[PDB]
CSV table of C-alpha atoms and ligand atoms in Angstrom, one decimal:
chain,number,residue,atom,x,y,z
A,1,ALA,CA,45.6,6.7,14.8
A,2,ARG,CA,41.9,7.2,13.7
A,3,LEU,CA,40.8,9.2,10.8
A,4,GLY,CA,40.5,7.8,7.4
A,5,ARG,CA,39.7,3.9,8.4
A,6,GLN,CA,37.7,5.2,11.4
A,7,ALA,CA,35.8,7.6,9.0
A,8,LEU,CA,33.6,5.0,7.4
A,9,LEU,CA,33.3,3.1,10.9
A,10,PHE,CA,30.8,5.6,12.0
A,11,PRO,CA,28.2,5.1,9.2
A,12,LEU,CA,28.8,1.4,9.5
A,13,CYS,CA,27.8,1.1,13.3
A,14,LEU,CA,24.9,3.5,12.6
A,15,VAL,CA,23.7,0.9,10.1
A,16,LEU,CA,24.3,-1.8,12.3
A,17,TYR,CA,22.2,-0.1,15.0
A,18,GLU,CA,19.7,0.3,12.4
A,19,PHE,CA,19.8,-3.3,11.5
A,20,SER,CA,19.3,-4.4,15.2
A,21,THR,CA,16.4,-2.1,15.9
A,22,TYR,CA,14.8,-3.6,12.6
A,23,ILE,CA,15.2,-7.3,13.1
A,24,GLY,CA,14.2,-6.3,16.8
A,25,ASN,CA,10.9,-6.2,15.2
A,26,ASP,CA,11.2,-8.6,12.1
A,27,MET,CA,12.8,-11.6,14.0
A,28,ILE,CA,10.4,-11.2,17.0
A,29,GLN,CA,7.2,-11.8,15.1
A,30,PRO,CA,7.6,-15.5,14.4
A,31,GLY,CA,9.0,-16.2,17.7
A,32,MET,CA,5.9,-14.6,19.3
A,33,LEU,CA,4.1,-17.7,18.9
A,34,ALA,CA,6.7,-19.1,21.3
A,35,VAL,CA,6.2,-16.1,23.6
A,36,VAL,CA,2.4,-16.3,23.4
A,37,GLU,CA,2.7,-20.2,24.3
A,38,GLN,CA,5.1,-19.4,27.3
A,39,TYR,CA,2.9,-16.8,28.9
A,40,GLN,CA,-0.1,-18.6,28.0
A,41,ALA,CA,-1.7,-15.5,26.4
A,42,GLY,CA,-4.2,-15.4,23.3
A,43,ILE,CA,-2.7,-15.1,19.7
A,44,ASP,CA,-4.4,-11.6,19.7
A,45,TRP,CA,-1.1,-10.7,21.5
A,46,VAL,CA,1.1,-11.6,18.6
A,47,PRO,CA,0.5,-8.6,16.4
A,48,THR,CA,0.3,-6.4,19.5
A,49,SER,CA,4.1,-6.9,20.0
A,50,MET,CA,4.7,-5.0,16.6
A,51,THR,CA,1.9,-2.2,17.5
A,52,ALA,CA,3.7,-1.5,20.6
A,53,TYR,CA,7.2,-1.5,19.0
A,54,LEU,CA,6.0,0.9,16.4
A,55,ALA,CA,3.9,3.1,19.0
A,56,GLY,CA,7.4,3.6,20.8
A,57,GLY,CA,8.9,4.2,17.4
A,58,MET,CA,6.8,7.5,17.1
A,59,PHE,CA,7.1,8.8,20.7
A,60,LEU,CA,10.2,10.9,20.8
A,61,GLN,CA,11.3,12.1,17.1
A,62,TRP,CA,9.8,15.6,17.7
A,63,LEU,CA,11.9,16.0,20.8
A,64,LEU,CA,15.3,14.1,19.8
A,65,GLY,CA,16.4,16.3,16.8
A,66,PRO,CA,16.3,19.8,18.3
A,67,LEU,CA,17.4,18.3,21.8
A,68,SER,CA,20.5,16.5,20.3
A,69,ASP,CA,21.2,19.8,18.6
A,70,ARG,CA,21.5,21.6,21.9
A,71,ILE,CA,23.1,19.1,24.1
A,72,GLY,CA,24.8,17.1,21.4
A,73,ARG,CA,24.4,14.5,18.7
A,74,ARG,CA,27.0,12.2,20.5
A,75,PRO,CA,25.4,12.1,24.0
A,76,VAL,CA,22.1,11.4,22.7
A,77,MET,CA,22.7,8.8,20.4
A,78,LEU,CA,24.7,6.9,22.7
A,79,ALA,CA,21.9,7.1,25.1
A,80,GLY,CA,19.5,5.7,22.5
A,81,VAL,CA,21.7,2.8,21.9
A,82,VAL,CA,22.2,2.1,25.8
A,83,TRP,CA,18.4,2.3,26.1
A,84,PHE,CA,17.9,-0.4,23.4
A,85,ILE,CA,20.4,-2.7,25.0
A,86,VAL,CA,18.9,-2.2,28.5
A,87,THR,CA,15.3,-2.8,27.4
A,88,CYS,CA,16.1,-5.6,25.4
A,89,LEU,CA,17.8,-7.6,28.6
A,90,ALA,CA,14.8,-6.2,30.5
A,91,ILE,CA,12.2,-8.0,28.7
A,92,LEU,CA,13.3,-11.3,30.0
A,93,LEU,CA,12.0,-10.4,33.4
A,94,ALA,CA,8.7,-9.7,32.0
A,95,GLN,CA,6.0,-11.9,34.1
A,96,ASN,CA,3.1,-11.4,31.9
A,97,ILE,CA,2.1,-10.4,28.3
A,98,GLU,CA,1.2,-6.9,29.4
A,99,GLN,CA,4.7,-6.4,30.8
A,100,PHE,CA,6.3,-8.0,27.6
A,101,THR,CA,4.1,-5.4,25.6
A,102,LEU,CA,5.2,-2.8,27.6
A,103,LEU,CA,8.7,-3.3,27.2
A,104,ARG,CA,8.1,-4.0,23.5
A,105,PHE,CA,6.8,-0.3,23.6
A,106,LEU,CA,10.0,1.0,25.5
A,107,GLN,CA,12.2,-1.0,23.1
A,108,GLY,CA,10.7,0.9,20.1
A,109,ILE,CA,11.7,4.1,21.4
A,110,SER,CA,15.1,3.4,20.1
A,111,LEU,CA,13.8,3.6,16.4
A,112,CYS,CA,13.3,7.4,16.9
A,113,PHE,CA,17.2,8.1,17.4
A,114,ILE,CA,17.8,6.6,13.9
A,115,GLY,CA,16.3,9.6,11.8
A,116,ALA,CA,16.4,12.4,14.2
A,117,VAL,CA,19.8,12.2,15.5
A,118,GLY,CA,21.7,9.5,13.7
A,119,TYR,CA,20.9,10.6,10.3
A,120,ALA,CA,21.1,14.1,11.0
A,121,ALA,CA,24.6,13.3,12.3
A,122,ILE,CA,25.3,11.9,8.6
A,123,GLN,CA,23.9,14.9,6.7
A,124,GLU,CA,26.0,17.0,8.9
A,125,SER,CA,29.2,15.1,8.7
A,126,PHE,CA,29.7,14.0,4.8
A,127,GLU,CA,29.8,15.6,1.5
A,128,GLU,CA,26.5,15.3,-0.6
A,129,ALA,CA,27.8,12.7,-3.0
A,130,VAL,CA,29.0,10.3,0.0
A,131,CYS,CA,25.7,11.0,2.1
A,132,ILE,CA,23.7,9.6,-1.0
A,133,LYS,CA,25.8,6.2,-0.7
A,134,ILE,CA,25.2,6.0,2.9
A,135,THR,CA,21.5,6.6,2.5
A,136,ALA,CA,21.5,4.2,-0.1
A,137,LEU,CA,23.1,1.4,2.2
A,138,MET,CA,20.5,2.3,4.8
A,139,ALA,CA,17.8,1.8,2.3
A,140,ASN,CA,19.2,-1.6,1.5
A,141,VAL,CA,19.3,-2.7,5.2
A,142,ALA,CA,15.6,-1.6,5.4
A,143,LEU,CA,14.9,-4.0,2.6
A,144,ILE,CA,16.8,-7.1,3.8
A,145,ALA,CA,15.6,-7.2,7.6
A,146,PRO,CA,12.1,-7.6,6.7
A,147,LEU,CA,13.0,-10.7,4.5
A,148,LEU,CA,15.7,-12.1,6.7
A,149,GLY,CA,14.1,-11.6,10.0
A,150,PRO,CA,11.2,-13.9,9.6
A,151,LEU,CA,13.6,-16.6,8.1
A,152,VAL,CA,16.2,-16.2,10.9
A,153,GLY,CA,13.3,-15.9,13.6
A,154,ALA,CA,11.5,-19.0,12.4
A,155,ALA,CA,14.5,-21.0,12.4
A,156,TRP,CA,15.6,-19.5,15.8
A,157,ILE,CA,12.5,-20.8,17.7
A,158,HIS,CA,13.4,-24.3,16.3
A,159,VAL,CA,16.5,-24.4,18.3
A,160,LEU,CA,16.9,-21.5,20.8
A,161,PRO,CA,14.6,-19.5,23.2
A,162,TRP,CA,13.2,-16.3,22.4
A,163,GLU,CA,14.7,-14.8,25.2
A,164,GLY,CA,18.2,-15.7,23.2
A,165,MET,CA,17.1,-13.2,20.1
A,166,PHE,CA,16.9,-10.0,22.6
A,167,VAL,CA,20.4,-11.0,23.8
A,168,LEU,CA,21.2,-11.0,20.1
A,169,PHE,CA,19.9,-7.6,19.7
A,170,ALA,CA,21.7,-6.3,22.7
A,171,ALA,CA,25.0,-7.9,21.7
A,172,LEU,CA,24.7,-6.4,18.2
A,173,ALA,CA,23.8,-2.9,19.7
A,174,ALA,CA,26.7,-3.2,22.2
A,175,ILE,CA,29.2,-3.7,19.0
A,176,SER,CA,27.3,-0.7,17.5
A,177,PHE,CA,27.8,1.3,20.9
A,178,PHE,CA,31.5,0.8,21.0
A,179,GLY,CA,32.0,1.8,17.3
A,180,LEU,CA,29.9,4.8,17.9
A,181,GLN,CA,31.7,6.1,20.9
A,182,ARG,CA,35.0,5.9,18.9
A,183,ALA,CA,34.0,6.9,15.5
A,184,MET,CA,30.9,9.5,15.7
A,185,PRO,CA,31.7,13.2,15.4
A,186,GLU,CA,29.9,15.8,17.2
A,187,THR,CA,28.1,17.9,14.6
A,188,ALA,CA,25.4,19.7,16.8
A,189,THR,CA,25.4,23.4,15.8
A,190,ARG,CA,23.4,24.7,18.7
A,191,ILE,CA,25.0,23.5,21.6
A,192,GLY,CA,24.3,25.6,24.8
A,193,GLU,CA,21.0,27.1,23.3
A,194,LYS,CA,17.8,26.8,25.3
A,195,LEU,CA,15.0,24.5,24.0
A,196,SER,CA,11.5,26.0,23.8
A,197,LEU,CA,8.9,23.3,23.9
A,198,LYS,CA,6.2,26.0,23.2
A,199,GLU,CA,8.2,27.2,20.2
A,200,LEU,CA,8.5,23.6,19.1
A,201,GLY,CA,4.8,23.1,19.5
A,202,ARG,CA,4.3,26.0,17.1
A,203,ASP,CA,6.3,24.3,14.4
A,204,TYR,CA,4.4,21.2,14.3
A,205,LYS,CA,1.3,23.0,14.4
A,206,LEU,CA,2.5,24.9,11.3
A,207,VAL,CA,3.5,21.8,9.0
A,208,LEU,CA,0.0,20.2,9.9
A,209,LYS,CA,-1.7,23.1,8.5
A,210,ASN,CA,0.2,22.3,5.0
A,211,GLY,CA,-2.4,20.5,3.5
A,212,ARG,CA,-0.4,19.0,0.7
A,213,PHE,CA,2.2,17.7,3.1
A,214,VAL,CA,-0.4,15.9,5.4
A,215,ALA,CA,-2.1,14.3,2.4
A,216,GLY,CA,1.2,12.9,1.3
A,217,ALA,CA,2.4,11.9,4.8
A,218,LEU,CA,-0.9,9.8,5.3
A,219,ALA,CA,-0.7,8.3,1.9
A,220,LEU,CA,2.6,6.8,2.9
A,221,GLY,CA,1.0,5.3,6.0
A,222,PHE,CA,-2.0,3.7,4.2
A,223,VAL,CA,0.0,2.5,1.3
A,224,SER,CA,2.6,0.5,3.5
A,225,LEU,CA,-0.1,-0.7,5.9
A,226,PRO,CA,-0.7,-3.9,4.0
A,227,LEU,CA,2.9,-4.8,4.2
A,228,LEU,CA,3.2,-4.1,7.5
A,229,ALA,CA,0.0,-5.8,8.7
A,230,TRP,CA,1.2,-8.9,6.8
A,231,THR,CA,4.5,-8.7,8.7
A,232,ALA,CA,2.4,-8.3,12.0
A,233,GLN,CA,0.2,-11.4,11.4
A,234,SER,CA,1.4,-13.7,8.9
A,235,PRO,CA,2.5,-16.0,11.9
A,236,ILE,CA,-1.1,-16.3,13.0
A,237,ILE,CA,-2.7,-16.2,9.6
A,238,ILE,CA,-0.2,-19.1,8.2
A,239,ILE,CA,0.7,-21.2,11.3
A,240,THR,CA,-2.4,-21.2,13.7
A,241,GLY,CA,-4.9,-20.1,10.8
A,242,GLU,CA,-4.0,-22.1,7.7
A,243,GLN,CA,-2.4,-25.1,10.1
A,244,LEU,CA,1.0,-24.8,8.2
A,245,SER,CA,4.4,-25.1,9.4
A,246,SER,CA,7.4,-22.5,9.8
A,247,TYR,CA,8.6,-23.7,6.5
A,248,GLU,CA,5.3,-22.4,4.6
A,249,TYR,CA,5.3,-19.2,6.8
A,250,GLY,CA,9.0,-18.4,5.7
A,251,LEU,CA,8.8,-19.6,2.0
A,252,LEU,CA,5.8,-17.2,1.6
A,253,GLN,CA,7.9,-14.4,2.8
A,254,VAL,CA,10.2,-14.6,-0.2
A,255,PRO,CA,8.0,-13.8,-3.1
A,256,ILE,CA,6.5,-10.7,-1.1
A,257,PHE,CA,9.5,-9.2,0.4
A,258,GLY,CA,11.6,-10.3,-2.9
A,259,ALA,CA,9.1,-8.4,-4.9
A,260,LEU,CA,9.6,-5.2,-2.6
A,261,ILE,CA,13.4,-5.5,-3.6
A,262,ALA,CA,12.7,-6.2,-7.2
A,263,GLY,CA,10.5,-3.0,-7.3
A,264,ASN,CA,13.0,-0.8,-5.8
A,265,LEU,CA,16.1,-2.3,-8.1
A,266,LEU,CA,13.8,-1.3,-11.2
A,267,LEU,CA,13.1,2.1,-9.5
A,268,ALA,CA,16.9,2.5,-9.4
A,269,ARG,CA,17.3,1.9,-13.3
A,270,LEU,CA,14.4,3.8,-14.4
A,271,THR,CA,15.0,6.9,-11.9
A,272,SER,CA,17.0,8.9,-14.8
A,273,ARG,CA,14.3,8.7,-17.3
A,274,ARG,CA,11.2,9.0,-15.1
A,275,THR,CA,9.9,11.8,-12.8
A,276,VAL,CA,8.7,10.9,-9.4
A,277,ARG,CA,5.2,11.6,-10.4
A,278,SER,CA,5.3,9.0,-13.2
A,279,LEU,CA,6.9,6.4,-10.9
A,280,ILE,CA,4.0,6.8,-8.6
A,281,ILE,CA,1.4,6.2,-11.4
A,282,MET,CA,3.7,3.5,-12.5
A,283,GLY,CA,3.6,1.8,-9.2
A,284,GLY,CA,0.2,2.5,-8.6
A,285,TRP,CA,-1.1,-0.2,-11.2
A,286,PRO,CA,0.4,-3.1,-9.3
A,287,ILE,CA,-0.4,-1.7,-6.0
A,288,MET,CA,-4.2,-1.4,-6.9
A,289,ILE,CA,-4.3,-4.9,-8.9
A,290,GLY,CA,-2.2,-6.8,-6.1
A,291,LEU,CA,-4.5,-5.6,-3.3
A,292,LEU,CA,-7.5,-6.3,-5.7
A,293,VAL,CA,-6.5,-9.9,-6.3
A,294,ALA,CA,-5.6,-10.6,-2.8
A,295,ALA,CA,-9.1,-9.3,-1.6
A,296,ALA,CA,-11.3,-10.8,-4.4
A,297,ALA,CA,-9.6,-14.4,-4.2
A,298,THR,CA,-10.0,-14.6,-0.4
A,299,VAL,CA,-13.5,-13.4,-0.5
A,300,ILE,CA,-14.5,-16.1,-2.7
A,301,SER,CA,-12.5,-18.5,-1.2
A,302,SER,CA,-11.4,-18.0,2.5
A,303,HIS,CA,-8.3,-20.0,2.5
A,304,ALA,CA,-6.8,-19.2,-1.1
A,305,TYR,CA,-3.5,-18.3,0.8
A,306,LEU,CA,-1.3,-18.7,-2.3
A,307,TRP,CA,-3.4,-16.2,-4.2
A,308,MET,CA,-3.2,-13.8,-1.3
A,309,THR,CA,0.7,-14.2,-1.5
A,310,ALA,CA,0.6,-13.7,-5.2
A,311,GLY,CA,-1.6,-10.4,-4.7
A,312,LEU,CA,0.6,-9.1,-1.8
A,313,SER,CA,3.8,-9.9,-3.9
A,314,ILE,CA,2.4,-7.7,-7.1
A,315,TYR,CA,1.5,-5.0,-4.4
A,316,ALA,CA,4.8,-5.0,-2.8
A,317,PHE,CA,6.5,-4.6,-6.2
A,318,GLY,CA,4.3,-1.4,-6.6
A,319,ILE,CA,5.4,0.0,-3.2
A,320,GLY,CA,9.1,-0.6,-4.1
A,321,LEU,CA,8.8,1.5,-7.4
A,322,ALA,CA,6.4,4.1,-5.9
A,323,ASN,CA,7.4,4.5,-2.3
A,324,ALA,CA,10.9,6.4,-2.4
A,325,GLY,CA,9.4,8.5,-4.7
A,326,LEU,CA,6.4,9.9,-2.6
A,327,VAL,CA,8.8,10.2,0.3
A,328,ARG,CA,10.7,12.6,-1.8
A,329,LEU,CA,7.6,14.7,-2.8
A,330,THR,CA,6.3,14.7,0.7
A,331,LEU,CA,9.5,16.0,1.9
A,332,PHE,CA,9.5,18.9,-0.4
A,333,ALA,CA,5.8,19.6,0.0
A,334,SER,CA,6.6,21.6,3.1
A,335,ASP,CA,9.2,24.5,2.8
A,336,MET,CA,10.3,23.8,6.5
A,337,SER,CA,13.2,22.5,8.6
A,338,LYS,CA,13.8,18.9,7.4
A,339,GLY,CA,14.3,17.6,10.7
A,340,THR,CA,10.6,18.9,11.7
A,341,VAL,CA,9.2,17.7,8.4
A,342,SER,CA,11.0,14.1,8.6
A,343,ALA,CA,9.8,13.8,12.3
A,344,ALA,CA,6.1,14.9,11.3
A,345,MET,CA,5.8,12.5,8.4
A,346,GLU,CA,7.4,9.7,10.5
A,347,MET,CA,5.1,10.3,13.2
A,348,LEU,CA,2.1,10.6,11.0
A,349,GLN,CA,2.5,7.2,8.9
A,350,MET,CA,3.3,5.3,12.2
A,351,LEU,CA,0.0,6.5,13.7
A,352,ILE,CA,-1.7,4.8,10.7
A,353,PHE,CA,0.5,1.7,11.2
A,354,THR,CA,-0.3,1.5,14.8
A,355,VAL,CA,-4.0,2.0,14.4
A,356,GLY,CA,-4.3,0.1,11.2
A,357,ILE,CA,-2.4,-3.2,12.4
A,358,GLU,CA,-4.9,-3.3,15.5
A,359,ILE,CA,-7.9,-2.9,13.3
A,360,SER,CA,-6.4,-5.3,10.7
A,361,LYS,CA,-6.1,-7.8,13.8
A,362,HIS,CA,-9.6,-7.5,14.6
A,363,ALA,CA,-10.5,-7.9,10.9
A,364,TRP,CA,-8.7,-11.2,10.7
A,365,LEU,CA,-10.0,-12.3,14.0
A,366,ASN,CA,-13.8,-11.9,13.3
A,367,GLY,CA,-13.7,-12.4,9.6
A,368,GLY,CA,-10.5,-14.4,8.5
A,369,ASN,CA,-8.4,-13.8,5.4
A,370,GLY,CA,-11.3,-12.3,3.4
A,371,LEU,CA,-11.6,-9.2,5.8
A,372,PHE,CA,-8.0,-9.0,6.4
A,373,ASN,CA,-7.5,-8.4,2.7
A,374,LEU,CA,-10.5,-6.2,2.3
A,375,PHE,CA,-9.2,-3.8,5.0
A,376,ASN,CA,-5.7,-3.8,3.0
A,377,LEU,CA,-7.8,-2.9,-0.1
A,378,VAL,CA,-9.5,0.0,1.4
A,379,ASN,CA,-5.9,1.4,2.7
A,380,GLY,CA,-4.8,1.1,-1.0
A,381,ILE,CA,-7.9,3.0,-2.2
A,382,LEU,CA,-7.2,5.8,0.6
A,383,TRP,CA,-3.8,5.9,-0.8
A,384,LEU,CA,-5.1,6.3,-4.2
A,385,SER,CA,-7.5,8.9,-3.4
A,386,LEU,CA,-5.0,11.0,-1.7
A,387,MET,CA,-2.7,10.7,-4.8
A,388,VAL,CA,-5.4,12.0,-7.1
A,389,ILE,CA,-5.4,15.3,-5.0
A,390,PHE,CA,-1.7,15.2,-4.1
A,391,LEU,CA,-0.6,14.7,-7.7
A,392,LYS,CA,-3.6,16.7,-9.6
B,1,LDA,C1,8.2,0.3,2.5
B,1,LDA,C2,8.0,0.1,4.3
B,1,LDA,C3,7.6,1.2,4.9
B,1,LDA,C4,7.7,1.0,6.4
B,1,LDA,C5,8.3,2.2,7.2
B,1,LDA,C6,9.5,1.7,8.0
B,1,LDA,C7,9.3,1.7,9.5
B,1,LDA,C8,10.5,0.8,10.1
B,1,LDA,C9,9.7,0.1,11.3
B,1,LDA,C10,10.7,-1.1,11.5
B,1,LDA,C11,9.8,-2.6,11.1
B,1,LDA,C12,10.2,-3.0,9.7
B,1,LDA,N1,9.3,-3.3,8.8
B,1,LDA,C13,8.0,-4.1,9.2
B,1,LDA,C14,8.9,-2.1,8.4
B,1,LDA,O1,9.9,-4.1,7.9
B,2,LDA,C1,15.4,3.7,5.8
B,2,LDA,C2,16.6,4.7,6.4
B,2,LDA,C3,15.9,5.7,7.0
B,2,LDA,C4,17.0,7.0,7.3
B,2,LDA,C5,17.2,8.0,6.2
B,2,LDA,C6,16.1,8.1,5.1
B,2,LDA,C7,14.8,9.0,5.5
B,2,LDA,C8,14.9,10.3,5.1
B,2,LDA,C9,13.5,10.9,5.2
B,2,LDA,C10,12.5,10.9,6.3
B,2,LDA,C11,11.2,10.4,6.3
B,2,LDA,C12,10.9,9.2,5.7
B,2,LDA,N1,10.0,8.2,6.4
B,2,LDA,C13,9.7,7.2,5.4
B,2,LDA,C14,10.7,7.7,7.5
B,2,LDA,O1,9.0,8.9,6.6
B,3,PR,PR1,9.6,30.2,15.8
B,4,PR,PR1,11.7,26.5,14.7
C-alpha cells in the first residue's frame, strides 16, 4: 500500500539527509570550542573542522554520478547514508584532534551523494514542474541550516556534550535511511555498463578547457568564501577574539543569514522581470559595498565587530540575490553532461572554500579582524573581475 503517499516520502527523506549533512557542519562550529577544550588543542583547529568536512565534500562527486548510473542509484545512495551514520558515531572514539579532523573529512564525503546521485534520481523521477518544487525546498533547507545550526549548536553545548550532536546527526540520517530504503526508486539507465576511468578523465579535462565555464565556477567559490569563512571562524572571532558570549555569537548570525534569506526572497519576486545577468549586477552592489564597509571599518578600528556584522549582512543580501543566477549561467556555459558539469563546478568552488578558509584562518590569527575582512574583500574583487569577463 505505497505509491501515492510514498511518492513524496522519497524527496522528503533526501531533504532530511541534506539537512543532517548541513547541520553536520553548521551545528558543529559553535560546539567546536568545547571540542578544542576537551582535546586541549589550539583554537586554530576550530575552522579546520569545516575545512576537512568540505574537503571530503569534493572528494567523490566525479565518481559517484556515473558509478550510480552503472550499479544503481538506490544502493549507492543508501551506502552514502550508512557511511555518514557510521562516521558520525566513529568520531566519538577519536583520541586526538587530528583523528577528529580525519573523521571530519570522512564525514564530509557524505555531501558528494546529495547532488551526484540523490538529486540525479530526483531529475530522473519527477516531471519538470514537480522537480522545480523539490529543488526549491532543497534551496530553503540550504538557507535555514546555516542560521539554525549555530543557534541550536550554541544552545546545545550549554547543556549537552558535543558527542551528542553526532548521535543526533546519525539518528536523523537513520530516519532518512529507512525512508529512502522504502520510497526511493531505481532510475539508473546504464545498469550493467562498464565504467571507464580514462574516459571519465577525458570528460573532466574537456570541461576545464571551457574558459567561460571555469571563470563562472571559480567566481562562485570566491564570492561565497567570505560567508563560509565567517561560518568557519565566527566562534573564535566573537567568543575567544572579542571576549563575548554564545548569545552575542548567535545574535550576530541573525542579521547575516537573515539578509541571505531576504536576498533570496527578493530574487524570487524579481525573477520574472529581470534577466540573470542584471540580477548579478544588482547583487554586485551590496556584495562590494558590504565587503568594503567590513574591511574599512575593522582596519580603522580592529574591534568594530558590529560594523563587520553590518557589512557582512549587506554582502550576504547581495549573495542571496546574485548567487542562484550565476549558478544557472555557469551550468549553461558548458554544453556537456549535466552530471559532469555539476560535479566540476561543485569540485572547483569547494577547492576555493577549503584553501580560502585556511588562508582566512591565518589572516585572522596574524592580523585580527582587519586582515580577516581584507582577505574577504580580495575574494569579492576576484569575483568582480571574473564577472567583467564572464558577462562582457
Ligand atoms: C550560498 C552559499 C554557497 C555555499 C555552497 C554550499 C556548500 C554546502 C556545504 C555545507 C556547509 C553549509 N554552509 C556553511 C555553506 O552553510
Ligand atoms: C542546495 C541543494 C543542492 C542540490 C540541487 C541544486 C544544485 C544544481 C546545480 C549544481 C551546481 C551548484 N553548486 C552551487 C553546488 O555548484
Ligand atoms: Pr567519450
Ligand atoms: Pr562521457
